[PDB]
Amino acid sequence: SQLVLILGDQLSPSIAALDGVDKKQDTIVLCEVMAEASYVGHHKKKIAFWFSAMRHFAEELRGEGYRVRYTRIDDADNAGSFTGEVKRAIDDLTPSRICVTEPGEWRVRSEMDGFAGAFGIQVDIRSDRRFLSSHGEFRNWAAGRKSLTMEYFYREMRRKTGLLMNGEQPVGGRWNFDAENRQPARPDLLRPKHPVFAPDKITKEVIDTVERLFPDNFGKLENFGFAVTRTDAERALSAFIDDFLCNFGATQDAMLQDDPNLNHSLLSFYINCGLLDALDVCKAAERAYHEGGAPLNAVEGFIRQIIGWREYMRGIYWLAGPDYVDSNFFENDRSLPVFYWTGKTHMNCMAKVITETIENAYAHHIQRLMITGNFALLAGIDPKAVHRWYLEVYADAYEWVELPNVIGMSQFADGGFLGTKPYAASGNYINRMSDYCDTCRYDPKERLGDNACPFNALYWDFLARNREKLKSNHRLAQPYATWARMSEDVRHDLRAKAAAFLRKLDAAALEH
Ligand SMILES: Cc1cc2nc3c(=O)[nH]c(=O)nc-3n(C[C@H](O)[C@H](O)[C@H](O)COP(=O)(O)OP(=O)(O)OC[C@H]3O[C@@H](n4cnc5c(N)ncnc54)[C@H](O)[C@@H]3O)c2cc1C
Ligand code: SF4
């Protein structure tokens, strides 16, 4: 008989490990196991989402006729590790083999590589076919290139899937419509509200348990609205296609104080644990285009984020190896400011985004990149500490997708390995793309003096102190030219102002 192990982010009835299961003799094993349980950064809503999502999946599998062994977070016998739980399961079920789908984390994959020797039983680790490229295919793709860029890989995924393909030509005569998706947005108070799902009996029980076992963890549990069933996740997909997809590209980079969601889909939490399938989501958007529900620049832009970025990050993560997390191109050692955990900062943009993170366990892409990520980059934060924050505070966070977004795209801590450019930006960018500055005590137009937006001096200081490593970068040529034409006294005053702000950070850090 088989022991079929299914992990917390593999909540799909077509997951590879269920291939060829004998429903009457095999047993599916689901275990609420948290290796980092004592890390208080993990958002309470994320933990509640994990476990509620997993308990509904166990019930769904039983309704399908499977035999399911379930261990809760609060079970007295919970061994606290996948190995310990698999050992407890072997004792009950006396299987002749273990089937499991390859995990999405370096550390968990290695642990499972040890099952065969630790238990003396056959172990079959199956390739996770929810991704379009195997590890080997992606490695061979990268070997033929020398400089990796997402856009090359995306073109290959467009051909492999057929999405928005007319034979071997892209639908509409163009591969990518990003150029049309970059304007700022004014508020639109008729934009519909996003779907929320009231907690059912199982979710309320998880919510109470999380409050009881992680009382001092980051984040609020109030107004938990995540879908936790396959059917409700699809209701969230439907809501996005009917209400927001047609305007998705229009506002893709915009930020608004009173609208935390704009036209984003808010489906990442569901795709990443298996309640939605990535290719099914793209096909839904593609259908919307042919039925006239959305324009091409919006549909292609949406699909590019999933079979382009999301599939690319997965390949980068496995190709870069376990020690990618140690990338530190600029040699930063500064710790993460405590206001990333509290929101208690006078920078209005940072305050609002961190607050939304506290309350919702979600922020949309341009806030992760250009607000909290940009600040950490400019401030010279240790990239590993930035990594820990993003992995812990967002409900769609898993290492394989978060790490290449933090190490590569946001912090440039790999020196540009995945092909992006440095996203350093001054307060002038935030003032154009958002209305955060309108109610901020600081002034985005000032770089010196007590009123000045902190991003302005920090932007120049970042460029100045990293000049040897960045001067050849084409996209920074104009900024470095402007810098070299300032007087020595102006350059000196900008760096002294930046030092004074970094000093405020260091003095607070050397409290705790
Ligand atoms: C510092 C940083 C950390 C990030 N951490 C994560 C993370 O932990 N988990 C995560 O899923 N995404 C992460 N991203 C990518 C992106 O910000 C989120 O996927 C997005 O905000 C999810 O919101 P949404 O579902 O409304 O996406 P939408 O704006 O509706 O985008 C549609 C879908 O495309 C995918 N997608 C879009 N952008 C990216 C991207 N850059 N990389 C991978 N997939 C993408 C997601 O599946 C998303 O659901 C990160 C980006 C940055 C800059
Ligand atoms: S002024 Fe500087 S700090 Fe205040 S909001 Fe605009 S960008 Fe953020």
From Swiss-Prot:
This protein's UniProt keywords: 4Fe-4S, Chromophore, DNA damage, DNA repair, DNA-binding, FAD, Flavoprotein, Iron, Iron-sulfur, Lyase, Metal-binding, Nucleotide-binding
Catalysed reaction equations from the record: (6-4) photoproduct (in DNA) = 2 pyrimidine residues (in DNA)
Family indicated by similarity: Belongs to the iron-sulfur bacterial cryptochrome/photolyase (FeS-BCP) family.
Cofactor binding: number and manner: Binds 1 FAD per subunit. Binds 6,7-dimethyl-8-ribityllumazine (DMRL) as antenna chromophore.
Enzyme class at the top of the EC tree: lyase
Superkingdom field: Bacteria
Purpose of the protein: Photolyase involved in the repair of UV-induced (6-4) lesions in DNA. Catalyzes the photoreactivation of (6-4) pyrimidine-pyrimidone photoproducts by using blue-light energy. Can repair (6-4) photoproducts in ssDNA as well as in dsDNA.
Lineage: Bacteria, Pseudomonadati, Pseudomonadota, Alphaproteobacteria, Hyphomicrobiales
SUPFAM superfamilies cross-referenced by the UniProt entry: Cryptochrome/photolyase FAD-binding domain (SSF48173)
Gene from which the chain derives: phrB
GO BP, sorted A to Z: photoreactive repair
Organism of derivation: Agrobacterium fabrum (strain C58 / ATCC 33970) (Agrobacterium tumefaciens (strain C58))
Residues annotated to bind FAD: H264, S265, L266, L267, S268, N272, Y362, A363, H364, H365, D396, N405
Protein name, entry field: (6-4) photolyase
EC numbers for this chain: 4.1.99.13
Cofactor(s) in the UniProt record: FAD; 6,7-dimethyl-8-(1-D-ribityl)lumazine; [4Fe-4S] cluster
Amino-acid positions noted as binding [4Fe-4S] cluster in the UniProt annotation, renumbered to this chain: C349, C437, C440, C453
Gene3D superfamilies: 1.25.40.80, Deoxyribodipyrimidine photolyase-related, DNA Cyclobutane Dipyrimidine Photolyase, subunit A, domain 3, HUPs
